[PDB]
């Protein structure tokens, strides 16, 4: 869990800027490992994000190496070299439909594991999905994540914090209730972003205008060239009624079966 500052080498060039993300190298027992380091320079929030990540073990979720207490509080993670999925797709508009399906299916597998483990992510967006390879996605950014109480299937927040409203379900907005079904709503927005090659959702609209549009039963249109079955799935993720909205087990199954058909049809 606690790492030696002497064994960490930080590169001066910053990956992101929320906080700062730096590429680094950490000397392990024999080999050196490439890492991405979250720097604080708020201290209890980093420790709680570390607390969440240490409990998670899945191929589709970013692996935490440990924490470092030196100049600043640092969260050291295994490096996903290709970066955020939204920026990747913005810069690589030639990515095939079968490939986007493959990646959003990998996110659903990671979320199906988070659901089973009774953790709510609460920041599922394309900017928080990292690419290991063009064919391998991992979920990151557990800063807002919560381990659900054993007797409840939702987390209740106290007062509006720093929230990404465009990705949030109506029960999150109106009742401050976060469940794995509210993460399914964000997964629908993330899917829309993915088939829109990293375009921002609800472009040019204020959070309040997004709320009002959703309350009238309106939803973002079908992205250019997005498969119909995938757009039907987003709409099912955007079911207003929490009870009728599918869970991640159901969403993953639809993605699995559809992806196996696309792979078949290809060759």
Ligand X SMILES: CN(C)Cc1cnn(-c2ccnc3[nH]c(-c4cccc5c4ccn5C)nc23)c1
Positions at the binding site = 15-21, 38
Q: How far is the CB of 186 from ligand X (least distance, A)?
A: 15
Task: Pick the binder of ligand X from 52, 80, 100, 126 (CB under 6 A).
Answer: 80
48 binds ligand X (CB under 6 A): no
Residues from 162 through 201 that contact ligand X (CB under 6 A): none
What three-state secondary structure class fits 262?
A: helix
Separation between Cα atoms, residue 252 and residue 178, nearest integer Å: 20
Q: Which residues of 127-139 are buried (b: 16+ CB within 10 A; e: fewer)?
A: bbbbbbeeeebbb
Q: CB-wise, 81 or 261, nearer to ligand X?
A: 81
Other beta carbons within 10 Å of 202:
17
Exposure of 74 by Cβ count < 10 A (0-12 exposed, 13-18 middle, 19+ buried)?
buried
Task: Pick the binder of ligand X from 3, 10, 56, 84 (CB under 6 A).
Answer: 84
Separation between Cα atoms, residue 86 and residue 61, nearest integer Å: 17
Q: How many residues bind ligand X (CB under 6 A)?
A: 18
Q: How far is the CB of 138 from ligand X (least distance, A)?
A: 7
Separation between Cα atoms, residue 153 and residue 183, nearest integer Å: 12
Task: Pick the binder of ligand X from 24, 66, 83, 188 (CB under 6 A).
Answer: 83
Tokens of 174: 């109106």
Q: CB-wise, 65 or 184, nearer to ligand X?
A: 65
Task: Pick the binder of ligand X from 62, 184, 210, 226 (CB under 6 A).
Answer: 62
130 binds ligand X (CB under 6 A): yes
126 binds ligand X (CB under 6 A): no
Task: Pick the binder of ligand X from 106, 108, 140, 145 (CB under 6 A).
Answer: 140
Active site residues: 123
| Contact in structure between 134 and 224 (CB atoms under 8 Å) | no
Other beta carbons within 10 Å of 105:
21
- Which residue ranges make up the site for ligand X (CB under 6 A)? 15-16, 21, 36, 38, 62, 77, 79-81, 83-84, 87, 127-128, 130, 140-141
């Amino acid at each position: 869990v606690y790492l030696d500052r002497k064994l960490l080498t930080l590169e001066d060039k910053e990956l992101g800027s929320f906080g700062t993300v730096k590429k680094g190298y950490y000397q392990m027992k024999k080999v050196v490992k490439t890492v991405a380091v979250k720097i604080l320079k708020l201290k209890d929030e980093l420790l709680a994000e570390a607390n969440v990540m240490q409990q998670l073990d899945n191929p589709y979720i970013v692996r935490m190496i440990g924490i470092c207490e030196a100049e600043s509080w640092m969260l050291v993670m295994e490096m996903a070299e290709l970066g955020p999925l939204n920026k990747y797709l913005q810069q690589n508009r030639h990515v095939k439909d079968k490939n986007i399906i493959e990646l959003v299916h990998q996110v659903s597998m990671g979320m199906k594991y988070l659901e089973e483990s009774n953790f709510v992510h609460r920041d599922l967006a394309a900017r928080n999905v990292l690419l290991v390879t063009q064919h391998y996605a991992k979920i990151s950014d557990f800063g807002l994540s919560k381990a659900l109480r054993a007797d409840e299937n939702y987390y209740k927040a106290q007062t509006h914090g720093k929230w990404p409203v465009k990705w949030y379900a109506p029960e999150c907005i109106n009742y401050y209730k976060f469940s794995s079904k509210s993460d399914v709503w964000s997964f629908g927005v993330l899917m829309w972003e993915a088939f829109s090659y990293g375009q921002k959702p609800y472009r040019g609209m204020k959070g309040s205008e997004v709320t009002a549009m959703l309350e009238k039963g309106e939803r973002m249109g079908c992205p250019a060239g997005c498969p119909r079955e995938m757009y039907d799935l987003m709409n099912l993720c955007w079911t207003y009624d929490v009870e009728n909205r599918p869970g991640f087990a159901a969403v993953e199954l639809r993605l699995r079966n559809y992806y196996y058909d696309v792979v078949n049809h290809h060759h």
